[PDB]
Amino acid sequence: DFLAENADIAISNPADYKGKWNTVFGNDNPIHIEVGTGKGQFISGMAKQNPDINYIGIELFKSVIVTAVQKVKDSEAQNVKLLNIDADTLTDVFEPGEVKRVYLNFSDPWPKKRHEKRRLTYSHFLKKYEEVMGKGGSIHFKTDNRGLFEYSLKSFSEYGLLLTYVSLDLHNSNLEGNIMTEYEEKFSALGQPIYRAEVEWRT
Amino acid sequence: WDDFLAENADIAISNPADYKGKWNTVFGNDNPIHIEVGTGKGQFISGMAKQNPDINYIGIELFKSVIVTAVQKVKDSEAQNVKLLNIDADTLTDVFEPGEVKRVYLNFSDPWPKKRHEKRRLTYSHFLKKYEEVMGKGGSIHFKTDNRGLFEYSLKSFSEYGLLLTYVSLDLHNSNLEGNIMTEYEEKFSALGQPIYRAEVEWRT
Ligand SMILES: [K+]
Ligand SMILES: [K+]
Ligand SMILES: [K+]
Numbered sequence: 001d002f003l004a005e006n007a008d009i010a011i012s013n014p015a016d017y018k019g020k021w022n023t024v025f026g027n028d029n030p031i032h033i034e035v036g037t038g039k040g041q042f043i044s045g046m047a048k049q050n051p052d053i054n055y056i057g058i059e060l061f062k063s064v065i066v067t068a069v070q071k072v073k074d075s076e077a078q079n080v081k082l083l084n085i086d087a088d089t090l091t092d093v094f095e096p097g098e099v100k101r102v103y104l105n106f107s108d109p110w111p112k113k114r115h116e117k118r119r120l121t122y123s124h125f126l127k128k129y130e131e132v133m134g135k136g137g138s139i140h141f142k143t144d145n146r147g148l149f150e151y152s153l154k155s156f157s158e159y160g161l162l163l164t165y166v167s168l169d170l171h172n173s174n175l176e177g178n179i180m181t182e183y184e185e186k187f188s189a190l191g192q193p194i195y196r197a198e199v200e201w202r203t
Numbered sequence: 204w205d206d207f208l209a210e211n212a213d214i215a216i217s218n219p220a221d222y223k224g225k226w227n228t229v230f231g232n233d234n235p236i237h238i239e240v241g242t243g244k245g246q247f248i249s250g251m252a253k254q255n256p257d258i259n260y261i262g263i264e265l266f267k268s269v270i271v272t273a274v275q276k277v278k279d280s281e282a283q284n285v286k287l288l289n290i291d292a293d294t295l296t297d298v299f300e301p302g303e304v305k306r307v308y309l310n311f312s313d314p315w316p317k318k319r320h321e322k323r324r325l326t327y328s329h330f331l332k333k334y335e336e337v338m339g340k341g342g343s344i345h346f347k348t349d350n351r352g353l354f355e356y357s358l359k360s361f362s363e364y365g366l367l368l369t370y371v372s373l374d375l376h377n378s379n380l381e382g383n384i385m386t387e388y389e390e391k392f393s394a395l396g397q398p399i400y401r402a403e404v405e406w407r408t
Contacts, residue, residue, distance in 0.1 A: 150371045153358070163362035166355045168373060168400070195373070 002066055003084075009069045014083045019095040024081065025054045030100040033058065033132075035087050035107070035120055038182065040068030042105055045179030047077040055080045058087070087125055090132050097134035104141040105181050109148040121152040126159045130201070138200040142170065142178075144187075149195040156199045165198035207271055208289070214277045215270065219288050224300040230259045230284065236299075237306040238263065238337075240292050240325060243386065245273025247310055250384035252277075252285040261304075263288045263295070292330055295337050302339040309346040310386050314353040326357040331364045335406070343405040347375065349392060354400040361404045370403035 003010045011017070011024070022028050029052055034043050037057035047055050057080065059065040065084055072080045085093065107120040116122055121141065129139060139161075143149050156163065167173045171189055184194065208215045216222070216229075227233050234257050239248050242262035252260050262285065264270040270289050277285045288298065295304075312325040321327060326346065334344060344361075348354050361368065372378045376392065376399055392399055 146373050150373060153371050154368050157362065157368035161362075163359050166358050168351050168355055 003062070003069070006069050006073060009072050009080070010065065010082050010084070012084070014085060014093040015089075018093055019098065021054075021056075021094070021098055025079065027054070029054045029079070031056060031094075031098060032101040032103065033090075033099050034103040034105070035090075035125075036060075036105065037068050037082065038064055040065075040071045040082070041185070042103070042179055042181045043068065043080055043082075044071040044075055044077065046103075047072070047080045048075055049177060049179060051077075051079060053079065056083060057081075058083045058085050058090070060084070060086060087120065087128060090128050094132040096131060097136065099129075099132045100137050102129050102133070102137065102139050104139065104143075106143050106145070106183055107141075107148065109143075109145045111147055116151075119148065119151065119155075121148070121155050123155065123159055126155065126161075133201075135201040135203060138164075138198055140196075140198050142194060142196040144184075144192055144194050146195075149197070153197065156197070160202065161199040162202050163197060163199055165196070167196040168193065170194040170196045204271060205267070208267070208274065211274050211278060214285070215274050215287050215289065217289075219290060219294075219298040223298055224303065226259075226261075226299070226303055229286065232259070234259050234284075235305040236261060236303060237308065238295075238304050239308040239310065240295075241265075241310065241312055242273050242287065243269055243310075243388075245270075245276045245287070247308070247384055247386045248273065248285060248287075249276040249280055249282065251308075252282045253280065254382060254384060256282075256284060258284065260285045261288060262286075263290050263292070265289070265291050292325065292333055295333050299337040301336060302341065304334075304337040305342050307334045307338065307342065307344045309344060309348075311348050311350075311388055312346075312353065314348075314350045316352055321356075324353065324356065324360075326353070326360050328360065328364060331360070331366075338406075340406040340408050343369075343403060345401075345403050347386075347389075347399060347401045349389075349397055349399050351400070354402070358402065361402070365407065366404045367407055368402060368404055370401070372401040373398060375399040375401045 031054045034057045037059040043057040068082050104120050110118045236259045239262045242264040248262040315323045
């Protein structure tokens with residue numbers, strides 16, 4: 001396997017490092033995660049922009065995480081690890097408070113009511129994010145899907161989160177230094193709007 | 204004119220403070236009272252009054268020149284469930300008792316883009332408090348705007364205050380919302396391209 005020869009980037013045993021992720025990276029830098037990494041343009045780009053932040057990207061499909069490891073093998077970035085796990089197993093990999101941020105980019109919308117439970121912004125997953133971040137983290141979410149974003153804002157509110165940032169047209173707003181995904185850098189810059197939100201826990 | 208409002212004092216209540224806690228006696232019924240801050244020409248409020256006869260409506264508008272037009276719409280379209288007040292949002296606490304108002308409507312409110320004018324926005328914490336002082340914890344705010352900057356600010360301001368977002372549309376004219384009454388200004392956004400944003404926010408009970 002191609003994943004075995006690059007086992008320094010793609011970790012096959014993440015559960016063994018629960019509470020000890022600072023020993024893997026070798027520093028106490030904040031750990032920011034991404035659920036649904038895909039081909040990895042986002043995670044690799046964020047890695048090069050922020051060398052002093054540790055990134056861990058999770059992806060369900062083996063066939064696509066292969067391209068993500070290649071992008072981290074291209075750019076010398078030593079601050080990115082990739083895991084082939086489900087979002088439900090994040091609590092088996094991280095201790096409460098070990099993660100400082102969760103990134104959700106163009107997550108699967110699942111518009112049908114029966115599949116509300118599958119949306120990465122539904123209460124079940126918001127609970128999993130809390131269980132790995134404690135009360136000191138944040139969720140940075142961006143999508144071009146109107147329905148999912150509308151649902152997400154209501155879901156964040158119902159759960160009791162604080163909306164600290166919201167952009168209803170990201171491209172003609174402040175491009176602080178946001179890295180685009182493969183899908184984002186592919187479709188329109190002056191067409192369909194991209195929505196963005198930053199939510200955190202109240203203290 | 205000031206002569207027109209004095210002639211039509213049954214619609215344009217000149218002494219609203221006198222009816223504090225007694226607004227049900229003005230309408231002659233115990234139906235819910237819903238208010239609109241910044242009525243303008245009054246198309247929204249007259250349309251809502253026509254659509255919902257079982258709800259009592261009170262529109263407030265500071266600009267005396269434009270409230271005259273709002274009164275004319277109520278005078279012609281004989282609805283008995285609409286009263287209009289020539290006051291500001293700060294005076295709402297002198298006019299209503301806690302729990303007397305069940306809903307606050309905000310339509311295309313002044314954006315006030317500049318940071319130094321944040322406190323003048325109808326969705327700022329001060330006005331949210333004024334709305335709580337007339338609604339208690341059992342009401343809601345129904346807000347519509349085309350201004351991206353104001354909507355974004357409002358969402359964060361509603362969140363900071365601890366309010367619950369129950370409805371949100373980021374393109375109202377292409378949404379499910381049936382029975383949507385449009386303002387004069389809203390009627391041009393149908394096929395211009397630019398989206399109208401809408402939110403319904405309530406208190407946690
Ligand atoms: K994704
Ligand atoms: K909220
Ligand atoms: K208005």
